[PDB]
Amino acid sequence: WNQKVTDFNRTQSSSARRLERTQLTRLQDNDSRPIDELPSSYLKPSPALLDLRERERHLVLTKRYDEATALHKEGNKMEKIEELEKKRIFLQTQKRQRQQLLAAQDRDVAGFKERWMRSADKLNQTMDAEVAQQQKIVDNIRKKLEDAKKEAL
Amino acid sequence: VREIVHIQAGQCGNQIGAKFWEVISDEHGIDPTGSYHGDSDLQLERINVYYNEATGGKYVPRAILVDLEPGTMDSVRAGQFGQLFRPDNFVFGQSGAGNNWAKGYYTEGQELCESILDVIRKEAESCDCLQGFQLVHSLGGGTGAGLGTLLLNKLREEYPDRILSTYSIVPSPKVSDTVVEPYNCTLSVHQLVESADEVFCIDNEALYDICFRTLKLTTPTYGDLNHLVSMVMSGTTCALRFPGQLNSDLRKLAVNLVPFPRLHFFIVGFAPLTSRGSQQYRALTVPELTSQLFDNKNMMAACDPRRGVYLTASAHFRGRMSSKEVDEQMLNIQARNTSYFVEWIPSNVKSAICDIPPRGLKMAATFIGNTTAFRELFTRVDSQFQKMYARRAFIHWYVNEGLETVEFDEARSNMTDLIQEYEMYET
Amino acid sequence: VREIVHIQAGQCGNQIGAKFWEVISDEHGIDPTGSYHGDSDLQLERINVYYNEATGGKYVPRAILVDLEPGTMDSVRAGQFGQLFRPDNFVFGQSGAGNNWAKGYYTEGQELCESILDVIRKEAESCDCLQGFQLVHSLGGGTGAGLGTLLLNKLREEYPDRILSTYSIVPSPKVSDTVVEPYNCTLSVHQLVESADEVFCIDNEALYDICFRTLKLTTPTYGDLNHLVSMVMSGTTCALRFPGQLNSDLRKLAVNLVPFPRLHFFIVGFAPLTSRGSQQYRALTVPELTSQLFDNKNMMAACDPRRGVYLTASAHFRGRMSSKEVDEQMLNIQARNTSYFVEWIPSNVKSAICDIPPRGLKMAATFIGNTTAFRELFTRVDSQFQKMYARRAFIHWYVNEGLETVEFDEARSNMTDLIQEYEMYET
Amino acid sequence: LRPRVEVPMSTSNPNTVRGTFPKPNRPAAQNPTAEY
């Protein structure tokens, strides 16, 4: 039965850190992906920005250039305020997702052990029953042998 | 106590929703002003799924109606059913729809999005439990395709566990109501694949064909065409609202019919449908129902299953009926036409029975199926999209709103890989 | 026997004060002639909190009205309840206000300061005990902001132990009724921070937003706006006047809500405010009040709590109600939105229950909260002040009265430090 | 003699990005051959 513990240990040790290497694998990749870029979907401008550059088009096309300079000044100003915001929102969302993904790996580890503690509990239960019976029977015979001896010594 | 929140987007959604709320209000015996004038106690057992109660004996639907232009909404108000809905659940913009997917998604959709979400927060967090949400929209338009998908992403972010069932109308292949449809249909499907758990596809052509073939209507208006759609929407949730011999709600339906997360586009069909004059002569029984359901002509989506194979199929039965008679048909219809089911999944037909039928009918049955015949639907739109995209000028309407041409490539590629995936599980 | 002395300053104070006594007199049951004609014994229990009794069954409020020009005083007396006040508590000057803080504080204030204190003295020392004073004034003006703060210093020196609760109206961000508010409000805060115990901030635009959003008033007038504020002043002192299952008077409020001596600016809100049509859809439940109070739209000050974090919060409930139901809502609302509360203070929501509700309503609630979001409203006036200060703007009017230029620099520095102090405790 | 539980290991912002707003439609001509 002591040999069964070794087979228990090798099965547990191989399976435990098979999961642990895999648990790091998905965390290794997603945690160091491109963060210094705003993808295409995040670059969409506000509708208020559309009219300013639409009205700036006609100011240029009508050959009214003095007034076109003012709107270009306000257009670039209104981009900088809006560019900073979507950088913050993407960085806020990007930070959350890795936190959200990371917390899922450890929950599976918590459930991973529950499958292994109880399996050892059943193994420990069968461990105790057989040796106790073997010691119970042999001790009685050892007691019985001395009981017959007690008639003489 | 498995509450469902209902959302209607655009012109197509409101007209479907308006007809839909008549059907259930009749089923539960509810007056249009909101009072129960009903005929039995069993209608009040689990009415909480769809209606909220206002002190005074009035029942208010868990509905939010969404539009970009106020024209559609006022048709609901001026209509017969214009008092039932809560006033605060009408949220509308003051800009044209544009009939444009990009403009609705990015330009006007953002402004309405935060206003919409808080209304849902009022409805979503008002009930003890919440099984899922329900959205009705069309894919060819601009508001339902553009703003409808935007809301579907946010709802997934906030309520990941809940079932986001959607009923969608796909652009027709022969004659269609909008020119820019291949651009609107392609971009919407990319969003729908990764977001919604379940999608039901409905085509207007089959409804014209079904009414003209079976119901023998000479002049089918949208009133009767939407009536066929509303029967499917009520039939799916009938297990929640009434007792029965064997229950099966949405999450049972999603578990059984969906073998992989991406293959979840469904076709629907309803039986019995019989001519208004021929109904007297018809001996409607359990075996008769199955003949109509699996018949290719009763499919509400124009995708002939005989050109593909079935992966999973589900049938819902309503009314007092034999469980033995129901079970035998699932054997026979699966065994008689073995060329139309996948071999590596035995028992492809799911079944369920509900106690209480809809009004007028002693027994009725509903069919939901997933098949590789859907490759037909997406092949048509991709070819038309490719035909138009070869001349990038129409894209200028979408570029002036901010959409980049790469997003067309991303959407088409994701749709293409879905088609190839259906092909390879056919073997 | 916890008497309170009431002081009103300027145009804003008298008109808010005049409506305030219409609310209380109807609540207690006092005919506008000053006589008791009530319906319950509980009303005569603790009328001594606010009233004195002249021999004959005539009750006189403990009110003192302060102004520099008697224009608004005479508009009050022509009103229905103007006869109630004692004629000798009307203290006024004979010179224009000037809408100038330095003019109110130094030139006309010193002349009036001599007489006003003795009128305060008669009412402060005619009662068996005195818990604190009650001030109503606006900060954008020159009479309420200037002379109101000067009396605040004298009251603190003479009566240090007593609670000097003040109610203030903050200048609005979009449209504001005075050019020189940045000078007036910046100086006024310097006096309010060091002398007052409790300060409540009300913004006029939020009052407009509530009236148009919730009550659907097509034309809200200053009678309706002042009506909303009266409920909060009525609500806070209700624990003194009527029995309750869990009492919480002014001094309990300050100890629990105020963690540090300088952070005591508060925001308020009142529920239920019911739309004139939405009522038939609204069932009054204990949860229904809780949703309204913590809703950001209901807040009476136009600084968004979501942009900051809460330090303490308090909810007052009025009527006969379950004590379990109130206590549960505090735990649920705290745990559901943990992102807006500070970690190093658990159980951030204080609660109380009072037995007698306002007339017509079987249940009502009041909210008082403290948050870092007040950093928004100080930065606004600091930004406006510096621009008017960088070039010498209207300053020459204040310097001529005798105010030194170093008083502004002390005023801005102290105001700036309170902005940093909110920032530091956010971590 | 007895089984043993094995302890497994647990696996538990700058705004400098490169993107910019998209390409707009522009009014200036691009045909110098017939314009210059």
Ligand SMILES: Nc1nc2c(ncn2[C@@H]2O[C@H](COP(=O)(O)OP(=O)(O)O)[C@@H](O)[C@H]2O)c(=O)[nH]1
């Ligand atoms: N079946 C059905 N289809 C409809 C109904 N109303 C509109 N549609 C379809 O919706 C499509 C376009 O809808 P649209 O007006 O663009 O709505 P939008 O999404 O808000 O822009 C058209 O192909 C119509 O056939 C209806 O009541 N029933």
Ligand SMILES: Nc1nc2c(ncn2[C@@H]2O[C@H](COP(=O)(O)OP(=O)(O)O)[C@@H](O)[C@H]2O)c(=O)[nH]1
């Ligand atoms: N809520 C409310 N605010 C008022 C009323 N009357 C004036 N105000 C506000 O009080 C602020 C300053 O008033 P002001 O005339 O300077 O009062 P003063 O202190 O006597 O000089 C202005 O911004 C007004 O908007 C009123 O009846 N109700």
